[PDB]
Amino acid sequence: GTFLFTSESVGEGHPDKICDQISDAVLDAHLQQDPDAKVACETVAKTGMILLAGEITSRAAVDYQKVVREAVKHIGYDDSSKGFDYKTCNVLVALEQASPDDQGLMFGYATDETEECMPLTIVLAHKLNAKLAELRRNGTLPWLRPDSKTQVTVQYMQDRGAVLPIRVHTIVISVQHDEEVCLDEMRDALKEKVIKAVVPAKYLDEDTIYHLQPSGRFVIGGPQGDAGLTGRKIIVDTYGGWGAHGGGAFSGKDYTKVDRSAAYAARWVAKSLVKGGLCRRVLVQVSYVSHPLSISIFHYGTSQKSERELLEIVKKNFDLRPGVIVRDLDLKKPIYQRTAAYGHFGRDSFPWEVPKKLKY
Amino acid sequence: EGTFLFTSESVGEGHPDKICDQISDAVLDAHLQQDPDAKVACETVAKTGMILLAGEITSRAAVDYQKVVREAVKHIGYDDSSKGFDYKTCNVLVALEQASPDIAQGVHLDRNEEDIGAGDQGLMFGYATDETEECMPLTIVLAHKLNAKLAELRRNGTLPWLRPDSKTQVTVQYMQDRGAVLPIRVHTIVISVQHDEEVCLDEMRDALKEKVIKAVVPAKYLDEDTIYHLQPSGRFVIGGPQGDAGLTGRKIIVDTYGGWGAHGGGAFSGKDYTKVDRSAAYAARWVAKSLVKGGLCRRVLVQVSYAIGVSHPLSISIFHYGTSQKSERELLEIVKKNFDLRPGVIVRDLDLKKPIYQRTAAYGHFGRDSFPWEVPKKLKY
Ligand SMILES: C[S@@+](CC[C@H](N)C(=O)[O-])C[C@H]1O[C@@H](n2cnc3c(N)ncnc32)[C@H](O)[C@@H]1O
Ligand SMILES: [K+]
Ligand SMILES: [Mg+2]
Ligand SMILES: [Mg+2]
């Protein structure tokens, strides 16, 4: 009675994530000037090209040059030797901006297996990419480049529906590098200076499988290696394969799109229930008229209470009308670029990650 | 054990996201018809008056991209500016390069058919369920089949005022049974479809209920209380790309299990078999259907995972929702004796170098009659 489970994550310089950041950077630029701006911005990236397409209703007037190039500068693509460069890339704008003059099924999920209230597979996957970026920027590993991917397999057991992480079974890391460092040195660095500094020692053992630079070469990367598009990392963005997904992407959409804000809300509910002591693992499902059509709470058997009883607690403590959601969570503020890498869930930076006290 | 509600969505060929998925695979088919070993990774972008291709291709084939793209827009049904898009007069822009030499040395160069490494890392899921002969959730089968009937009646002349863009949503009421799910009745149906200027809504809502819903949803799930939302936002004369943006790989829940099971995040369209995103998801579906159709369980989830350059899987997991005599560990062992989930062997069993892929790009990749991953394998145990 044990099982395995896997999740991936992706660095700031991954081509799909580059577009998620540019998309949310534009949303922030518009909101900074017009709190009621309406945005649906798609980004596309390939060798030498950043392209902006979509619709916007907004009083603002945005410098898309400074917006795109500053973000590419932050990510770290600044020379042709790296495959991309913010000073010399082509910035094409096909957006349609006007002056002012949906429904769905969304999911929330939470698990008491970590402080982040998130599956250990994805938490670890995210943190490894953050560590790569941190050692690249501070000088510790100057051969590292911005494009990276990680994935983590954990061996678990059950206990009345809750999941208990036993060991890390397999870790993958592929990362774009410069032309001077050799293969042995890279695999050594990845294990000793990145993995061992990120994964708690209790999860590591002599049996753990390492696939470090498995392709054997990764000089060509970024958009030159692989075309990038907004909203192509929706599982990296959310629960790593756990829980569920209704199917909408987050980046480049404003708060009036229920796909984003109601999804955040459902995470908020799920995290509140677990941290409130009511269950150890939970799925929240909101069906969508401003009041939601239906709500069901699946606790996997980890609550003394019944599922009817939890619904009652939820209804007595929360108002999930998109209008009210937007007020309580403060979603008109320009804080969206921060969400676009390392996951929108399980970071102690955002309003929907602060649990609510439940009076019942 | 107690009833609940679930909804799935589907979209028509003329929805801007699905346009991109279809073009991507039409480009893949063009290449495979000439070179079965072509490596293709084609992304499509769609917006007011433009189709753009961006991505990577290594192929011995010669392809006329303008011809391939415009033919598919015609096939979809956009031939005039009054519909919001015209294949004769749109802008087609091409940014397609060779695949990275770094990738190729790591994956395929100097290796056997069976021993080619995975094209990328990632995770993927298979799902199946005895609630239909299709072995698919009823919510998503119905939503897809509604969009199929719409395109059928539009194309053959039965309702010639219909246009290419549409969205459907189907809500079903369910009860549990020892972990399995039992579809009882349909609670809500929602349909918007693009139409010609010259038709009235009243008449249109009537054809939708009578020629479309009634001919697709078995009568047993239809009752006095079933809520119908037909053309709920009124007239819908202009559709597709016009005033809208769309991308390849943006309808990945629609493409698969309509909210049910799980997803790993890999898009299907525009990718040849060496992308495990496609090949391994197709195989996972094959496994899951075989386990259910073999009588070994009533509902099942299957996970796999890969690392770039490595042929073998990094992990395999089976979840039966409590619907089996045998344990989950017992079911894993049966899978391991019966299947070889190396991509260089999946290609052979499912025949994945054949140019069949434009068919998969609307109305779901699963629950389809003729696709190889839907013919269940007889299992030895
Ligand atoms: C490997 S590619 C897959 C598809 C690719 N476009 C193709 O033409 O085959 C996707 C991701 O893998 C990572 N990657 C790119 N080149 C790589 C290499 N040589 N080795 C390992 N990973 C790589 C990048 O982060 C990239 O975003
Ligand atoms: K890509
Ligand atoms: Mg991608
Ligand atoms: Mg992926």
Coordinates of C-alpha atoms in Angstrom, one line a residue, chain B residues 28-330:
Chain B
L28 CA 1.6 17.8 -39.4
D29 CA -0.5 15.7 -41.9
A30 CA 1.1 17.6 -44.9
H31 CA 4.5 16.5 -43.7
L32 CA 3.7 12.9 -42.7
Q33 CA 2.1 12.2 -46.1
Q34 CA 5.6 12.6 -47.6
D35 CA 8.1 11.8 -44.7
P36 CA 6.8 9.5 -41.9
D37 CA 9.8 10.4 -39.7
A38 CA 9.4 14.2 -39.9
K39 CA 9.8 15.9 -36.5
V40 CA 7.1 18.6 -36.2
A41 CA 6.4 21.2 -33.5
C42 CA 3.9 23.7 -35.0
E43 CA 2.2 26.4 -33.1
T44 CA -0.6 28.5 -34.7
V45 CA -1.8 32.0 -33.7
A46 CA -5.2 33.5 -34.9
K47 CA -6.6 37.0 -34.7
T48 CA -8.4 39.7 -36.9
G49 CA -7.4 38.9 -40.5
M50 CA -4.2 36.8 -39.6
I51 CA -3.0 33.2 -39.2
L52 CA 0.6 32.9 -38.0
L53 CA 2.7 29.7 -37.8
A54 CA 5.7 29.6 -35.4
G55 CA 7.7 26.6 -34.3
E56 CA 10.2 23.9 -35.4
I57 CA 10.4 21.3 -38.2
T58 CA 13.0 18.7 -39.5
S59 CA 11.5 17.0 -42.6
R60 CA 12.5 15.7 -45.9
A61 CA 9.0 16.9 -47.2
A62 CA 8.2 20.0 -49.3
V63 CA 5.1 21.7 -48.2
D64 CA 3.2 24.7 -49.5
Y65 CA 2.2 26.4 -46.2
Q66 CA -0.1 29.1 -47.8
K67 CA -2.0 26.3 -49.6
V68 CA -2.2 24.1 -46.5
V69 CA -3.4 26.9 -44.2
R70 CA -5.9 28.5 -46.6
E71 CA -7.4 25.1 -47.5
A72 CA -8.1 24.4 -43.9
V73 CA -9.7 27.8 -43.3
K74 CA -11.9 27.1 -46.3
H75 CA -12.6 23.6 -44.9
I76 CA -13.6 25.1 -41.6
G77 CA -16.1 27.4 -43.5
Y78 CA -14.6 30.9 -43.5
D79 CA -14.9 32.3 -47.1
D80 CA -16.3 35.8 -46.8
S81 CA -15.8 39.0 -44.7
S82 CA -19.5 38.9 -43.6
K83 CA -18.6 35.8 -41.5
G84 CA -15.6 37.7 -40.0
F85 CA -12.9 35.8 -41.9
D86 CA -12.0 34.9 -45.5
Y87 CA -9.4 32.3 -46.5
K88 CA -8.9 34.0 -50.0
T89 CA -7.8 37.4 -48.5
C90 CA -6.4 36.8 -44.9
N91 CA -2.8 37.4 -43.9
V92 CA -0.7 34.2 -43.5
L93 CA 2.8 34.6 -41.9
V94 CA 5.4 31.9 -41.5
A95 CA 8.1 31.6 -38.8
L96 CA 9.2 27.9 -39.0
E97 CA 12.8 26.8 -38.4
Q98 CA 14.9 23.7 -38.1
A99 CA 14.6 21.9 -34.7
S100 CA 17.6 22.5 -32.3
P101 CA 20.6 20.2 -33.1
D102 CA 21.1 20.0 -29.3
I103 CA 17.7 18.3 -29.0
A104 CA 18.3 15.8 -31.9
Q105 CA 21.6 14.4 -30.6
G106 CA 19.9 13.8 -27.2
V107 CA 16.8 12.1 -28.5
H108 CA 16.9 10.3 -31.9
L109 CA 20.3 10.5 -33.9
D110 CA 22.2 7.2 -33.9
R111 CA 19.5 5.2 -32.1
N112 CA 17.2 2.2 -32.9
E113 CA 13.4 2.7 -33.6
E114 CA 12.5 1.1 -30.1
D115 CA 15.3 3.0 -28.3
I116 CA 14.5 6.7 -29.3
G117 CA 14.5 8.8 -26.2
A118 CA 11.5 10.8 -25.0
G119 CA 11.3 14.2 -26.9
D120 CA 10.7 16.1 -23.7
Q121 CA 10.1 15.7 -20.0
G122 CA 6.6 15.6 -18.5
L123 CA 3.6 13.9 -16.9
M124 CA 0.4 12.5 -18.6
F125 CA -2.9 10.9 -17.7
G126 CA -5.3 8.3 -18.9
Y127 CA -9.0 7.9 -17.8
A128 CA -11.9 5.5 -18.5
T129 CA -15.4 4.9 -17.2
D130 CA -18.1 2.4 -17.8
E131 CA -20.9 5.0 -17.8
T132 CA -21.0 5.0 -21.7
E133 CA -20.2 2.4 -24.5
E134 CA -17.6 5.1 -25.4
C135 CA -15.9 4.6 -21.9
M136 CA -16.0 8.3 -21.5
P137 CA -17.9 10.8 -19.2
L138 CA -21.4 11.6 -20.4
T139 CA -21.1 15.3 -19.9
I140 CA -18.2 15.6 -22.5
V141 CA -19.5 13.0 -25.0
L142 CA -22.8 15.0 -25.2
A143 CA -21.1 18.4 -25.5
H144 CA -18.8 17.2 -28.3
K145 CA -21.6 15.4 -30.2
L146 CA -23.8 18.5 -30.1
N147 CA -21.0 20.4 -31.9
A148 CA -20.5 17.6 -34.4
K149 CA -24.2 17.5 -35.3
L150 CA -24.1 21.3 -35.8
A151 CA -21.2 21.1 -38.2
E152 CA -22.8 18.1 -40.0
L153 CA -26.1 19.8 -40.7
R154 CA -24.4 23.0 -41.7
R155 CA -22.1 21.2 -44.2
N156 CA -24.8 18.9 -45.8
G157 CA -27.4 21.7 -46.3
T158 CA -30.0 20.7 -43.7
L159 CA -29.6 24.0 -41.8
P160 CA -27.6 26.1 -44.4
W161 CA -27.9 29.3 -42.3
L162 CA -25.5 27.9 -39.6
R163 CA -21.9 29.3 -39.4
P164 CA -18.6 27.8 -38.1
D165 CA -18.1 29.2 -34.5
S166 CA -20.0 27.5 -31.5
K167 CA -19.9 26.7 -27.8
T168 CA -21.8 24.1 -25.9
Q169 CA -22.1 23.2 -22.2
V170 CA -23.9 20.1 -20.7
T171 CA -24.7 19.7 -17.0
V172 CA -25.5 16.2 -15.7
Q173 CA -26.9 14.9 -12.4
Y174 CA -25.1 11.9 -11.0
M175 CA -25.2 9.5 -7.9
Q176 CA -22.2 7.3 -6.7
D177 CA -22.1 3.5 -6.5
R178 CA -19.0 2.0 -4.7
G179 CA -16.7 4.7 -6.2
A180 CA -18.4 4.5 -9.7
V181 CA -20.6 7.2 -11.2
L182 CA -24.2 6.7 -12.6
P183 CA -25.6 9.4 -14.9
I184 CA -29.3 9.8 -14.0
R185 CA -30.8 12.8 -16.0
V186 CA -29.5 15.9 -17.8
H187 CA -30.0 19.1 -15.7
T188 CA -28.9 22.0 -18.2
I189 CA -28.0 22.3 -21.9
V190 CA -26.4 25.5 -23.3
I191 CA -25.8 26.2 -27.1
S192 CA -24.5 29.3 -28.9
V193 CA -23.8 29.0 -32.7
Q194 CA -22.7 31.5 -35.3
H195 CA -25.5 32.2 -37.9
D196 CA -26.4 34.0 -41.1
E197 CA -28.0 37.5 -40.9
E198 CA -31.2 36.3 -42.4
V199 CA -32.8 34.0 -39.8
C200 CA -35.0 34.7 -36.6
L201 CA -33.9 33.6 -33.2
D202 CA -37.3 31.9 -32.4
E203 CA -37.0 29.6 -35.5
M204 CA -33.4 28.9 -34.6
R205 CA -34.1 27.9 -31.0
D206 CA -36.7 25.5 -32.4
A207 CA -34.3 23.8 -34.9
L208 CA -31.7 23.6 -32.1
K209 CA -34.0 21.7 -29.7
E210 CA -35.6 19.5 -32.5
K211 CA -32.9 18.8 -35.2
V212 CA -29.9 18.9 -32.8
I213 CA -30.5 18.2 -29.1
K214 CA -33.3 15.6 -29.8
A215 CA -31.2 13.7 -32.3
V216 CA -28.1 13.5 -30.0
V217 CA -29.2 13.1 -26.3
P218 CA -31.1 9.9 -25.5
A219 CA -34.7 10.7 -24.4
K220 CA -34.3 9.0 -21.0
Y221 CA -32.1 11.8 -19.7
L222 CA -34.6 14.5 -21.0
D223 CA -37.5 15.5 -18.7
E224 CA -40.0 18.3 -17.7
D225 CA -37.4 20.1 -15.6
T226 CA -34.4 20.1 -17.9
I227 CA -33.3 23.8 -18.4
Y228 CA -32.5 24.8 -22.1
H229 CA -30.4 27.9 -22.8
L230 CA -30.5 28.2 -26.6
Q231 CA -28.8 31.3 -28.2
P232 CA -28.7 32.8 -24.7
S233 CA -26.7 35.9 -25.8
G234 CA -28.9 36.6 -28.8
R235 CA -27.6 37.3 -32.3
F236 CA -24.2 35.9 -33.2
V237 CA -23.6 36.9 -36.8
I238 CA -19.8 37.5 -36.6
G239 CA -17.4 34.9 -35.2
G240 CA -14.1 33.2 -35.3
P241 CA -10.9 35.3 -35.1
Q242 CA -12.6 38.7 -35.7
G243 CA -12.2 40.8 -32.6
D244 CA -10.8 37.7 -30.8
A245 CA -7.4 36.0 -30.3
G246 CA -6.7 32.2 -30.3
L247 CA -3.7 29.9 -29.9
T248 CA -2.8 26.2 -30.4
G249 CA -3.1 24.1 -27.2
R250 CA -5.7 26.3 -25.3
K251 CA -8.6 23.9 -25.2
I252 CA -6.7 20.9 -23.5
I253 CA -9.6 20.0 -21.1
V254 CA -12.1 20.0 -24.0
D255 CA -9.6 17.9 -25.9
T256 CA -9.5 15.2 -23.2
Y257 CA -12.0 14.4 -20.3
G258 CA -14.1 17.6 -19.9
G259 CA -13.0 18.2 -16.3
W260 CA -12.9 14.5 -15.2
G261 CA -9.8 12.5 -14.3
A262 CA -6.7 14.7 -14.2
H263 CA -4.4 16.5 -16.7
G264 CA -0.5 16.8 -17.0
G265 CA -0.5 20.0 -19.1
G266 CA 0.7 18.8 -22.5
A267 CA -1.1 20.0 -25.7
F268 CA -1.7 17.5 -28.6
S269 CA -1.9 19.5 -31.8
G270 CA 1.1 20.2 -34.1
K271 CA 3.3 17.5 -32.6
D272 CA 4.6 14.2 -34.1
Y273 CA 4.9 10.9 -32.1
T274 CA 8.2 11.7 -30.4
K275 CA 6.5 14.2 -28.2
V276 CA 5.2 12.0 -25.4
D277 CA 2.6 14.8 -24.7
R278 CA 0.7 13.1 -27.6
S279 CA 2.1 9.6 -27.8
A280 CA 2.1 8.7 -24.1
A281 CA -1.3 10.4 -23.5
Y282 CA -2.8 8.3 -26.3
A283 CA -1.3 5.1 -24.8
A284 CA -2.4 6.0 -21.3
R285 CA -6.0 6.2 -22.7
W286 CA -5.4 2.8 -24.3
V287 CA -4.4 1.2 -21.0
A288 CA -7.3 2.7 -19.1
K289 CA -9.9 1.6 -21.6
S290 CA -8.4 -1.9 -21.7
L291 CA -8.6 -2.3 -17.9
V292 CA -12.3 -1.3 -17.8
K293 CA -13.3 -3.2 -21.0
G294 CA -11.4 -6.2 -19.5
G295 CA -13.8 -6.2 -16.5
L296 CA -10.9 -5.4 -14.1
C297 CA -12.6 -2.2 -12.8
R298 CA -15.4 0.3 -13.5
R299 CA -13.5 3.6 -13.4
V300 CA -9.7 4.2 -13.6
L301 CA -6.9 6.8 -13.6
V302 CA -3.4 6.2 -15.0
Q303 CA -0.3 8.4 -14.6
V304 CA 3.0 8.2 -16.5
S305 CA 6.1 10.5 -16.6
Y306 CA 9.2 11.0 -18.8
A307 CA 12.6 12.6 -19.0
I308 CA 14.1 14.0 -22.3
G309 CA 16.5 11.7 -24.0
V310 CA 15.4 8.6 -22.0
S311 CA 13.2 5.9 -23.6
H312 CA 11.7 4.3 -20.5
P313 CA 9.1 5.9 -18.2
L314 CA 10.2 7.4 -14.9
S315 CA 7.0 6.4 -13.0
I316 CA 3.6 4.6 -13.4
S317 CA 0.6 4.8 -11.1
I318 CA -2.9 3.3 -11.1
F319 CA -6.0 4.7 -9.2
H320 CA -9.3 2.7 -9.3
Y321 CA -11.6 4.9 -7.2
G322 CA -12.4 1.8 -5.1
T323 CA -14.1 0.1 -8.1
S324 CA -12.1 -3.2 -8.2
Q325 CA -11.7 -6.6 -6.5
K326 CA -7.9 -6.3 -6.9
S327 CA -5.6 -3.7 -5.3
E328 CA -4.0 -0.8 -7.1
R329 CA -0.6 -2.4 -6.7
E330 CA -2.0 -5.6 -8.3

